[PDB]
Amino acid sequence: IVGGKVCPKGECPWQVLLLVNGAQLCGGTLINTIWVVSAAHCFDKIKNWRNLIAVLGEHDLSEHDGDEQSRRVAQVIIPSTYVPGTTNHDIALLRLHQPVVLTDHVVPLCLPERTFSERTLAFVRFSLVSGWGQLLDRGATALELMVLNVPRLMTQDCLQQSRKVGDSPNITEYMFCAGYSDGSKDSCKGDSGGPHATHYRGTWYLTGIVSWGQGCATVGHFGVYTRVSQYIEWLQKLMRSEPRPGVLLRAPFP
Amino acid sequence: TVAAYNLTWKSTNFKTILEWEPKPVNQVYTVQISTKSGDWKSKCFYTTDTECDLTDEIVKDVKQTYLARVFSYPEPLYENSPEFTPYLETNLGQPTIQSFEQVGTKVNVTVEDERTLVRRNNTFLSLRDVFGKDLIYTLYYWKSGKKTAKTNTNEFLIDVDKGENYCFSVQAVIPSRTVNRKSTDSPVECM
Amino acid sequence: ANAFLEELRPGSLERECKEEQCSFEEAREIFKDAERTKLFWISYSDGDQCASSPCQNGGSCKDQLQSYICFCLPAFEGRNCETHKDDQLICVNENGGCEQYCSDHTGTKRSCRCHEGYSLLADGVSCTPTVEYPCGKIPILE
Ligand SMILES: N=C(N)c1ccc(CNC(=O)[C@H](CCC(N)=O)NC(=O)[C@@H](Cc2c[nH]c3ccccc23)NS(=O)(=O)CC(=O)O)cc1
Ligand SMILES: *[C@@H]1O[C@H](CO)[C@@H](O)[C@H](O)[C@H]1O
Ligand SMILES: *[C@@H]1O[C@@H](C)[C@@H](O)[C@@H](O)[C@@H]1O
Ligand SMILES: [Ca+2]
Ligand SMILES: [Ca+2]
Ligand SMILES: [Ca+2]
Ligand SMILES: [Ca+2]
Ligand SMILES: [Ca+2]
Ligand SMILES: [Ca+2]
Ligand SMILES: [Ca+2]
Ligand SMILES: [Ca+2]
Ligand SMILES: [Ca+2]
């Protein structure tokens, strides 16, 4: 997170820290005691699928306390349409081996219904993006969970307000831009999979996933997030499904 | 379907209506308005007209800068409007001379304090209620030879040669303004 | 207006344009100077656009130069105050006033719903938590 601030302990309770072989891999969002929503690209180079850990209630990576709960990732579900190394359909649904305990420091973010998210949540200007990602473009990561308020843009505006470049990935209907083009605030690579949460009449909802962008907080560019509203049915159907042998699962989409 | 174009603000004394093209053919519209960092609010839901009254929204804070956009239906196709800051660009309506009394060798020309669409409490605020000191009135008077006077209130106190008739015309002005700095001349009134 | 021989009398704004309808020429004989006559004529001959009583629902019309302005009552808006503010109870309009989910209905007013872990209150629009840790709520701030 570039240009943000520290999320006071407990104020970003749905934030998840994903680790591979004990190393920091990506962020994630708890939406149930058993399910975590993250980004598909976070699993592009995973070799040891049995060494994936999801930590809830995390805040300061340099100090341990009793609010943190660790769980092995039993399954990583990715859309059959996602292609490693690319940006479209950048979403993953992770099933935890055992449910986490809901506490004052561990609470799930609400997965909204599609139409509510499309007709109401999509027009709430600001939303929070968070993670332990880079504090500066190509810089070091943060020890304390950072958070940032970013404004959303309809794609037509994003394209018009962005600096056109060569092999720039297309911004599809499964994505949306949010942030600033003056090079001051944005999420970054290390924040991938993290929540883009929208507050509406007393409740927070999952609207986006830190996905991609040109560098981090690059002048003339906005962060791009997976448009979660397009995957509500996909996610709901899968959460109502029975486990399947093998950690990695590619589920058809739509 | 085609996106709207030539979005234009038609505003006088804060009565603000957004207008646009083209004439909808198997095409409906929905307008959204917001301030720089505020949420988008929908208005004129699925209307077939090419206009939308946004008065009630902009009078909430006439000093804010608003942006509107028109969505077209058979994310949806849309077009953004130019930014609009009511206080700085709403047209001043044609004023009206309320009266003029003569005492001896001086005349008092009073300009009617016209009401605006800006609502506060349970009534409409006048032009001076809203602009305060930013508003002045200019008087263009002649004998029977052009003469002019300016006031920071709604009254003009001028000298007049007894036994002579004078005609008057007033104009509302906001000096600090760059565009739409003056209203049109009021109807002519003669003593 | 002109009656027989009245034109023998000097010009009079009151008798000619106030008590009667005066033409441009008559007005010019009063004001003389062209610039002054035109300044008078643009308003005098503009006509009252409020005559057609365009402002609906108890609004008030204010005549303007070649147009009009409608002042509406609280529950009304629109160029001619034709828009009923009380007839916009649909979901796309501020989520229908629903705290969480809104559903439009054909033949019945919109209904409000809630996310699992919440239940709809008697007011038909609010949602209350039915569990200790409902989603989307931050406990240390509650
Ligand atoms: N700003 C943000 N909020 C932001 C930025 C980055 C991320 C993490 N995601 C990535 O790095 C993905 C990974 C794709 C995969 N499946 O492996 N790649 C990207 O973003 C690439 C797309 C990209 C390729 N070719 C291009 C030519 C022109 C412009 C862009 C690109 N852009 S990049 O290389 O600049 C990212 C960097 O290095 O920081 C999250 C948030
Ligand atoms: C009332 O009269 C005005 C005159 O301008 C007209 O614009 C309206 O259409 C009519 O209803
Ligand atoms: C003119 O203004 C409108 C808004 C209403 O208050 C009318 O009663 C009044 O005459
Ligand atoms: Ca810790
Ligand atoms: Ca006559
Ligand atoms: Ca005559
Ligand atoms: Ca005459
Ligand atoms: Ca008379
Ligand atoms: Ca007569
Ligand atoms: Ca003549
Ligand atoms: Ca004559
Ligand atoms: Ca008129």
Short mmCIF file of N, CA, C and O in Angstrom, two decimals, chain A residues 131-240:
data_model
loop_
_atom_site.label_atom_id
_atom_site.label_comp_id
_atom_site.label_asym_id
_atom_site.label_seq_id
_atom_site.Cartn_x
_atom_site.Cartn_y
_atom_site.Cartn_z
N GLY A 131 -3.31 -4.31 2.98
CA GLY A 131 -2.33 -5.38 2.85
C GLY A 131 -0.97 -5.04 3.46
O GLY A 131 -0.74 -3.92 3.92
N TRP A 132 -0.08 -6.02 3.46
CA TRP A 132 1.28 -5.85 3.97
C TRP A 132 2.24 -5.69 2.79
O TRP A 132 3.43 -6.00 2.90
N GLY A 133 1.71 -5.21 1.67
CA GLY A 133 2.50 -5.02 0.47
C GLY A 133 3.49 -3.89 0.52
O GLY A 133 3.69 -3.27 1.58
N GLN A 134 4.11 -3.61 -0.62
CA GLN A 134 5.11 -2.55 -0.74
C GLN A 134 4.60 -1.17 -0.36
O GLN A 134 3.47 -0.79 -0.69
N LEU A 135 5.44 -0.43 0.35
CA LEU A 135 5.11 0.92 0.78
C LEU A 135 5.42 1.91 -0.34
O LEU A 135 4.89 3.01 -0.37
N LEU A 136 6.31 1.50 -1.25
CA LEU A 136 6.71 2.32 -2.39
C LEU A 136 6.92 1.43 -3.61
O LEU A 136 7.18 0.24 -3.47
N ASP A 137 6.81 2.01 -4.80
CA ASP A 137 7.01 1.25 -6.03
C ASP A 137 8.39 0.60 -5.97
O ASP A 137 9.39 1.29 -5.80
N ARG A 138 8.42 -0.72 -6.09
CA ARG A 138 9.67 -1.47 -6.05
C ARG A 138 10.40 -1.28 -4.71
O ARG A 138 11.63 -1.36 -4.65
N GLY A 139 9.64 -1.05 -3.65
CA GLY A 139 10.23 -0.86 -2.34
C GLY A 139 10.04 -2.08 -1.46
O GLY A 139 9.69 -3.16 -1.95
N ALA A 140 10.26 -1.91 -0.16
CA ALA A 140 10.11 -3.01 0.79
C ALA A 140 8.67 -3.10 1.29
O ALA A 140 7.93 -2.12 1.23
N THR A 141 8.30 -4.26 1.80
CA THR A 141 6.95 -4.47 2.31
C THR A 141 6.75 -3.92 3.72
O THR A 141 7.71 -3.56 4.41
N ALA A 142 5.49 -3.84 4.15
CA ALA A 142 5.17 -3.31 5.46
C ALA A 142 5.06 -4.36 6.56
O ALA A 142 4.57 -5.47 6.33
N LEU A 143 5.51 -4.01 7.75
CA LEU A 143 5.45 -4.91 8.89
C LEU A 143 4.08 -4.84 9.54
O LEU A 143 3.59 -5.84 10.05
N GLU A 144 3.46 -3.67 9.51
CA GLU A 144 2.13 -3.49 10.08
C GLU A 144 1.11 -3.32 8.96
O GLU A 144 1.35 -2.58 8.00
N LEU A 145 -0.02 -4.00 9.10
CA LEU A 145 -1.08 -3.94 8.10
C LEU A 145 -1.43 -2.51 7.74
O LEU A 145 -1.78 -1.72 8.61
N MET A 146 -1.34 -2.18 6.46
CA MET A 146 -1.66 -0.83 5.99
C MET A 146 -3.03 -0.81 5.30
O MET A 146 -3.50 -1.83 4.80
N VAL A 147 -3.66 0.36 5.26
CA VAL A 147 -4.98 0.52 4.65
C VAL A 147 -5.03 1.85 3.89
O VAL A 147 -4.34 2.81 4.25
N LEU A 148 -5.86 1.90 2.85
CA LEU A 148 -5.98 3.07 2.01
C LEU A 148 -7.38 3.24 1.42
O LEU A 148 -7.99 2.27 0.95
N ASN A 149 -7.87 4.48 1.43
CA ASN A 149 -9.18 4.79 0.87
C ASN A 149 -8.94 5.21 -0.58
O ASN A 149 -8.18 6.13 -0.84
N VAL A 150 -9.59 4.52 -1.52
CA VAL A 150 -9.43 4.83 -2.94
C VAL A 150 -10.79 4.97 -3.63
O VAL A 150 -11.72 4.23 -3.33
N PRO A 151 -10.90 5.94 -4.57
CA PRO A 151 -12.14 6.17 -5.31
C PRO A 151 -12.24 5.26 -6.53
O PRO A 151 -11.25 4.98 -7.20
N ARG A 152 -13.45 4.81 -6.83
CA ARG A 152 -13.67 3.91 -7.95
C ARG A 152 -13.97 4.66 -9.25
O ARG A 152 -14.49 5.78 -9.22
N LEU A 153 -13.62 4.06 -10.38
CA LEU A 153 -13.89 4.67 -11.68
C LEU A 153 -14.58 3.70 -12.62
O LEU A 153 -14.28 2.50 -12.62
N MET A 154 -15.51 4.21 -13.42
CA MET A 154 -16.14 3.37 -14.41
C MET A 154 -15.03 3.19 -15.44
O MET A 154 -14.18 4.07 -15.61
N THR A 155 -15.01 2.04 -16.11
CA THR A 155 -13.95 1.74 -17.06
C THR A 155 -13.73 2.77 -18.17
O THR A 155 -12.59 3.06 -18.52
N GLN A 156 -14.81 3.33 -18.71
CA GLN A 156 -14.67 4.33 -19.76
C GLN A 156 -13.79 5.47 -19.23
O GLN A 156 -12.88 5.93 -19.91
N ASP A 157 -14.06 5.92 -18.01
CA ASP A 157 -13.26 6.98 -17.41
C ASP A 157 -11.82 6.52 -17.18
O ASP A 157 -10.89 7.28 -17.43
N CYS A 158 -11.64 5.29 -16.70
CA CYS A 158 -10.29 4.79 -16.45
C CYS A 158 -9.45 4.84 -17.72
O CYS A 158 -8.34 5.37 -17.71
N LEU A 159 -9.97 4.28 -18.80
CA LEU A 159 -9.26 4.27 -20.08
C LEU A 159 -8.96 5.68 -20.58
O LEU A 159 -7.84 5.96 -21.00
N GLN A 160 -9.95 6.56 -20.51
CA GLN A 160 -9.77 7.93 -20.97
C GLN A 160 -8.73 8.68 -20.14
O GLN A 160 -7.94 9.45 -20.68
N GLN A 161 -8.73 8.44 -18.83
CA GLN A 161 -7.81 9.11 -17.91
C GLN A 161 -6.46 8.43 -17.72
O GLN A 161 -5.64 8.89 -16.93
N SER A 162 -6.21 7.33 -18.43
CA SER A 162 -4.94 6.64 -18.29
C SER A 162 -4.02 6.84 -19.49
O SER A 162 -4.49 7.08 -20.61
N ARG A 163 -2.72 6.77 -19.25
CA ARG A 163 -1.71 6.92 -20.30
C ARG A 163 -1.66 5.64 -21.13
O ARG A 163 -1.22 4.60 -20.64
N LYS A 164 -2.11 5.72 -22.37
CA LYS A 164 -2.10 4.55 -23.26
C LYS A 164 -0.68 4.02 -23.48
O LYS A 164 0.23 4.79 -23.78
N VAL A 165 -0.49 2.71 -23.32
CA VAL A 165 0.82 2.10 -23.51
C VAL A 165 0.73 0.86 -24.41
O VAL A 165 -0.35 0.30 -24.61
N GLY A 166 1.87 0.44 -24.95
CA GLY A 166 1.95 -0.70 -25.84
C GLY A 166 1.15 -1.96 -25.53
O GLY A 166 -0.05 -2.03 -25.81
N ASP A 167 1.82 -2.95 -24.95
CA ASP A 167 1.19 -4.23 -24.62
C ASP A 167 0.41 -4.24 -23.31
O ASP A 167 0.42 -5.23 -22.57
N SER A 168 -0.27 -3.13 -23.02
CA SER A 168 -1.06 -3.02 -21.80
C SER A 168 -2.24 -3.97 -21.83
O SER A 168 -2.98 -4.04 -22.81
N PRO A 169 -2.43 -4.74 -20.75
CA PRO A 169 -3.56 -5.67 -20.71
C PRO A 169 -4.87 -4.89 -20.83
O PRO A 169 -4.93 -3.72 -20.45
N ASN A 170 -5.90 -5.51 -21.37
CA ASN A 170 -7.19 -4.86 -21.51
C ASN A 170 -7.88 -4.86 -20.16
O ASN A 170 -7.66 -5.75 -19.35
N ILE A 171 -8.73 -3.86 -19.94
CA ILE A 171 -9.50 -3.78 -18.72
C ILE A 171 -10.84 -4.37 -19.13
O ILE A 171 -11.60 -3.74 -19.85
N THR A 172 -11.12 -5.59 -18.70
CA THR A 172 -12.35 -6.26 -19.09
C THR A 172 -13.53 -5.97 -18.16
O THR A 172 -13.43 -5.17 -17.23
N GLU A 173 -14.65 -6.63 -18.43
CA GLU A 173 -15.85 -6.47 -17.63
C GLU A 173 -15.69 -7.18 -16.28
O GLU A 173 -16.54 -7.05 -15.40
N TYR A 174 -14.61 -7.93 -16.13
CA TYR A 174 -14.34 -8.66 -14.89
C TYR A 174 -13.35 -7.88 -14.02
O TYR A 174 -12.77 -8.44 -13.08
N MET A 175 -13.19 -6.60 -14.31
CA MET A 175 -12.26 -5.73 -13.59
C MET A 175 -12.83 -4.33 -13.44
O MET A 175 -13.83 -3.98 -14.08
N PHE A 176 -12.18 -3.52 -12.62
CA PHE A 176 -12.57 -2.12 -12.45
C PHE A 176 -11.37 -1.40 -11.85
O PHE A 176 -10.58 -2.01 -11.12
N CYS A 177 -11.21 -0.12 -12.19
CA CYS A 177 -10.09 0.65 -11.67
C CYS A 177 -10.52 1.46 -10.47
O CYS A 177 -11.69 1.84 -10.33
N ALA A 178 -9.55 1.75 -9.62
CA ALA A 178 -9.79 2.55 -8.43
C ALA A 178 -8.45 3.15 -8.04
O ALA A 178 -7.41 2.53 -8.26
N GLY A 179 -8.47 4.34 -7.46
CA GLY A 179 -7.23 4.96 -7.05
C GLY A 179 -6.98 6.36 -7.56
O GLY A 179 -7.91 7.16 -7.74
N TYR A 180 -5.71 6.67 -7.78
CA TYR A 180 -5.29 7.98 -8.24
C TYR A 180 -4.24 7.86 -9.32
O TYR A 180 -3.44 6.93 -9.32
N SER A 181 -4.25 8.81 -10.25
CA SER A 181 -3.30 8.82 -11.35
C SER A 181 -2.18 9.84 -11.17
O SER A 181 -1.41 10.09 -12.10
N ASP A 182 -2.07 10.42 -9.98
CA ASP A 182 -1.02 11.40 -9.72
C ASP A 182 0.22 10.81 -9.04
O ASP A 182 1.09 11.55 -8.58
N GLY A 183 0.29 9.48 -8.99
CA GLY A 183 1.42 8.79 -8.40
C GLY A 183 1.57 8.85 -6.89
O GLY A 183 2.67 8.63 -6.38
N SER A 184 0.49 9.11 -6.16
CA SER A 184 0.57 9.21 -4.71
C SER A 184 -0.03 8.07 -3.89
O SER A 184 0.44 7.80 -2.79
N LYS A 185 -1.07 7.42 -4.40
CA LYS A 185 -1.74 6.37 -3.63
C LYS A 185 -2.24 5.20 -4.49
O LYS A 185 -2.83 5.40 -5.55
N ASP A 186 -2.02 3.97 -4.01
CA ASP A 186 -2.40 2.78 -4.76
C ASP A 186 -2.03 1.54 -3.92
O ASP A 186 -1.34 1.66 -2.91
N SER A 187 -2.52 0.37 -4.33
CA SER A 187 -2.14 -0.86 -3.66
C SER A 187 -0.95 -1.33 -4.50
O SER A 187 -0.61 -0.68 -5.50
N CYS A 188 -0.31 -2.44 -4.13
CA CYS A 188 0.85 -2.91 -4.88
C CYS A 188 0.87 -4.42 -4.97
O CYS A 188 -0.01 -5.09 -4.42
N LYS A 189 1.87 -4.96 -5.67
CA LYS A 189 2.03 -6.40 -5.86
C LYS A 189 1.85 -7.23 -4.59
O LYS A 189 1.11 -8.21 -4.59
N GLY A 190 2.54 -6.85 -3.52
CA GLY A 190 2.44 -7.59 -2.27
C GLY A 190 1.07 -7.56 -1.62
O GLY A 190 0.81 -8.31 -0.69
N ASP A 191 0.19 -6.68 -2.10
CA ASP A 191 -1.16 -6.56 -1.56
C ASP A 191 -2.16 -7.46 -2.30
O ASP A 191 -3.30 -7.63 -1.86
N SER A 192 -1.70 -8.04 -3.41
CA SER A 192 -2.51 -8.94 -4.24
C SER A 192 -3.37 -9.90 -3.42
O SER A 192 -2.90 -10.52 -2.47
N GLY A 193 -4.63 -10.03 -3.83
CA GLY A 193 -5.54 -10.92 -3.13
C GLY A 193 -6.27 -10.23 -2.00
O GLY A 193 -7.30 -10.72 -1.52
N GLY A 194 -5.74 -9.09 -1.59
CA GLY A 194 -6.33 -8.33 -0.51
C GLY A 194 -7.68 -7.75 -0.86
O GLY A 194 -8.03 -7.61 -2.03
N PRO A 195 -8.46 -7.38 0.16
CA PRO A 195 -9.79 -6.80 0.03
C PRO A 195 -9.87 -5.37 -0.49
O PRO A 195 -8.99 -4.55 -0.25
N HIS A 196 -10.95 -5.11 -1.22
CA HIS A 196 -11.31 -3.79 -1.71
C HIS A 196 -12.69 -3.84 -1.08
O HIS A 196 -13.59 -4.50 -1.61
N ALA A 197 -12.84 -3.21 0.09
CA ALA A 197 -14.09 -3.24 0.85
C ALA A 197 -14.88 -1.95 0.80
O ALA A 197 -14.34 -0.86 0.96
N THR A 198 -16.18 -2.08 0.61
CA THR A 198 -17.06 -0.93 0.50
C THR A 198 -18.04 -0.84 1.67
O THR A 198 -18.74 -1.80 1.99
N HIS A 199 -18.09 0.33 2.29
CA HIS A 199 -18.98 0.58 3.42
C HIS A 199 -20.31 1.11 2.89
O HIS A 199 -20.35 2.02 2.07
N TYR A 200 -21.41 0.53 3.36
CA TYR A 200 -22.73 0.99 2.93
C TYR A 200 -23.75 0.82 4.04
O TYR A 200 -24.06 -0.30 4.43
N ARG A 201 -24.25 1.94 4.54
CA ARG A 201 -25.24 1.94 5.61
C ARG A 201 -24.93 1.01 6.78
O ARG A 201 -25.73 0.15 7.13
N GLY A 202 -23.75 1.19 7.36
CA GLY A 202 -23.36 0.39 8.51
C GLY A 202 -22.71 -0.97 8.31
O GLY A 202 -22.32 -1.60 9.29
N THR A 203 -22.58 -1.43 7.07
CA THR A 203 -21.99 -2.74 6.80
C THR A 203 -20.97 -2.70 5.66
O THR A 203 -21.17 -1.99 4.68
N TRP A 204 -19.90 -3.48 5.80
CA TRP A 204 -18.84 -3.54 4.80
C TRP A 204 -19.03 -4.76 3.89
O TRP A 204 -19.36 -5.84 4.36
N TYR A 205 -18.79 -4.57 2.60
CA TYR A 205 -18.95 -5.63 1.60
C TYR A 205 -17.73 -5.78 0.71
O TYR A 205 -17.01 -4.82 0.46
N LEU A 206 -17.50 -7.00 0.22
CA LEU A 206 -16.37 -7.28 -0.67
C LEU A 206 -16.76 -6.88 -2.10
O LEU A 206 -17.68 -7.46 -2.68
N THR A 207 -16.07 -5.89 -2.65
CA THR A 207 -16.38 -5.44 -4.01
C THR A 207 -15.23 -5.68 -4.99
O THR A 207 -15.45 -5.79 -6.19
N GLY A 208 -14.01 -5.77 -4.48
CA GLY A 208 -12.89 -5.99 -5.37
C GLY A 208 -11.74 -6.75 -4.74
O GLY A 208 -11.70 -6.99 -3.53
N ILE A 209 -10.80 -7.15 -5.59
CA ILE A 209 -9.61 -7.88 -5.16
C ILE A 209 -8.39 -7.21 -5.78
O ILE A 209 -8.38 -6.94 -6.98
N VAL A 210 -7.38 -6.92 -4.97
CA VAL A 210 -6.15 -6.30 -5.48
C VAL A 210 -5.65 -7.26 -6.56
O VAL A 210 -5.30 -8.40 -6.25
N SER A 211 -5.63 -6.81 -7.81
CA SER A 211 -5.22 -7.68 -8.92
C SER A 211 -3.98 -7.27 -9.71
O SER A 211 -2.98 -8.00 -9.72
N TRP A 212 -4.04 -6.14 -10.39
CA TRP A 212 -2.88 -5.71 -11.16
C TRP A 212 -2.83 -4.22 -11.42
O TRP A 212 -3.67 -3.45 -10.94
N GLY A 213 -1.84 -3.81 -12.20
CA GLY A 213 -1.68 -2.41 -12.54
C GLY A 213 -0.30 -2.22 -13.11
O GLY A 213 0.50 -3.15 -13.13
N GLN A 214 -0.01 -1.02 -13.59
CA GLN A 214 1.31 -0.75 -14.14
C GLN A 214 2.14 -0.23 -12.99
O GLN A 214 1.98 0.91 -12.56
N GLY A 215 3.04 -1.07 -12.49
CA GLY A 215 3.87 -0.68 -11.37
C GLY A 215 2.94 -0.39 -10.20
O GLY A 215 1.85 -0.95 -10.12
N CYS A 216 3.37 0.49 -9.30
CA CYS A 216 2.56 0.84 -8.14
C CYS A 216 2.53 2.36 -7.97
O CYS A 216 3.57 3.00 -7.78
N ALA A 217 1.33 2.92 -8.04
CA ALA A 217 1.14 4.36 -7.90
C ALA A 217 1.95 5.09 -8.98
O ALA A 217 2.65 6.06 -8.71
N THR A 218 1.84 4.59 -10.21
CA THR A 218 2.54 5.18 -11.34
C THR A 218 1.69 6.31 -11.89
O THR A 218 0.48 6.17 -12.06
N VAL A 219 2.33 7.45 -12.13
CA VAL A 219 1.63 8.62 -12.66
C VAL A 219 0.95 8.26 -13.98
O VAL A 219 1.58 7.69 -14.87
N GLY A 220 -0.33 8.59 -14.09
CA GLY A 220 -1.07 8.30 -15.31
C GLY A 220 -1.73 6.94 -15.30
O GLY A 220 -2.26 6.50 -16.33
N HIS A 221 -1.72 6.26 -14.16
CA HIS A 221 -2.32 4.93 -14.06
C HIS A 221 -3.04 4.71 -12.74
O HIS A 221 -2.73 5.33 -11.73
N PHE A 222 -4.02 3.81 -12.79
CA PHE A 222 -4.85 3.45 -11.65
C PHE A 222 -4.68 1.96 -11.33
O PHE A 222 -4.29 1.17 -12.19
N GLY A 223 -4.98 1.58 -10.09
CA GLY A 223 -4.89 0.17 -9.76
C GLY A 223 -6.10 -0.51 -10.40
O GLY A 223 -7.13 0.13 -10.59
N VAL A 224 -5.96 -1.79 -10.74
CA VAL A 224 -7.06 -2.54 -11.34
C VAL A 224 -7.43 -3.66 -10.36
O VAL A 224 -6.56 -4.36 -9.85
N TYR A 225 -8.72 -3.83 -10.11
CA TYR A 225 -9.19 -4.84 -9.16
C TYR A 225 -10.17 -5.81 -9.82
O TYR A 225 -10.89 -5.43 -10.74
N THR A 226 -10.18 -7.06 -9.37
CA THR A 226 -11.10 -8.05 -9.91
C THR A 226 -12.51 -7.59 -9.51
O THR A 226 -12.73 -7.24 -8.35
N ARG A 227 -13.44 -7.56 -10.45
CA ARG A 227 -14.81 -7.13 -10.17
C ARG A 227 -15.60 -8.30 -9.57
O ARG A 227 -16.25 -9.06 -10.30
N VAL A 228 -15.53 -8.42 -8.24
CA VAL A 228 -16.19 -9.50 -7.51
C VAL A 228 -17.67 -9.75 -7.81
O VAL A 228 -18.12 -10.89 -7.73
N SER A 229 -18.42 -8.71 -8.15
CA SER A 229 -19.84 -8.88 -8.46
C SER A 229 -20.10 -9.89 -9.58
O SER A 229 -21.14 -10.53 -9.61
N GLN A 230 -19.15 -10.03 -10.49
CA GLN A 230 -19.26 -10.96 -11.60
C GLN A 230 -19.09 -12.43 -11.19
O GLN A 230 -19.46 -13.34 -11.94
N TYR A 231 -18.57 -12.65 -9.99
CA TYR A 231 -18.31 -13.99 -9.49
C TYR A 231 -19.16 -14.45 -8.29
O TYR A 231 -18.89 -15.49 -7.72
N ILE A 232 -20.19 -13.69 -7.92
CA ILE A 232 -21.01 -14.07 -6.77
C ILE A 232 -21.61 -15.47 -6.91
O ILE A 232 -21.46 -16.30 -6.02
N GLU A 233 -22.30 -15.72 -8.02
CA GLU A 233 -22.90 -17.03 -8.26
C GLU A 233 -21.84 -18.14 -8.30
O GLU A 233 -22.04 -19.22 -7.75
N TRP A 234 -20.72 -17.85 -8.95
CA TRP A 234 -19.63 -18.81 -9.06
C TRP A 234 -19.15 -19.19 -7.66
O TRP A 234 -18.96 -20.37 -7.35
N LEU A 235 -18.95 -18.18 -6.81
CA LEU A 235 -18.48 -18.38 -5.44
C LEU A 235 -19.51 -19.11 -4.58
O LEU A 235 -19.16 -20.04 -3.84
N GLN A 236 -20.77 -18.70 -4.66
CA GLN A 236 -21.82 -19.33 -3.86
C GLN A 236 -21.99 -20.81 -4.20
O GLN A 236 -22.14 -21.64 -3.30
N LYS A 237 -21.97 -21.13 -5.48
CA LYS A 237 -22.13 -22.51 -5.93
C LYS A 237 -20.99 -23.38 -5.39
O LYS A 237 -21.22 -24.47 -4.87
N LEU A 238 -19.76 -22.88 -5.49
CA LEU A 238 -18.59 -23.61 -5.02
C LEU A 238 -18.55 -23.80 -3.50
O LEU A 238 -18.08 -24.82 -3.02
N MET A 239 -19.02 -22.81 -2.75
CA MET A 239 -19.03 -22.94 -1.29
C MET A 239 -20.03 -24.01 -0.85
O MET A 239 -19.92 -24.57 0.24
N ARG A 240 -21.01 -24.30 -1.71
CA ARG A 240 -22.01 -25.31 -1.41
C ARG A 240 -21.61 -26.67 -1.99
O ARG A 240 -22.42 -27.59 -2.02
#
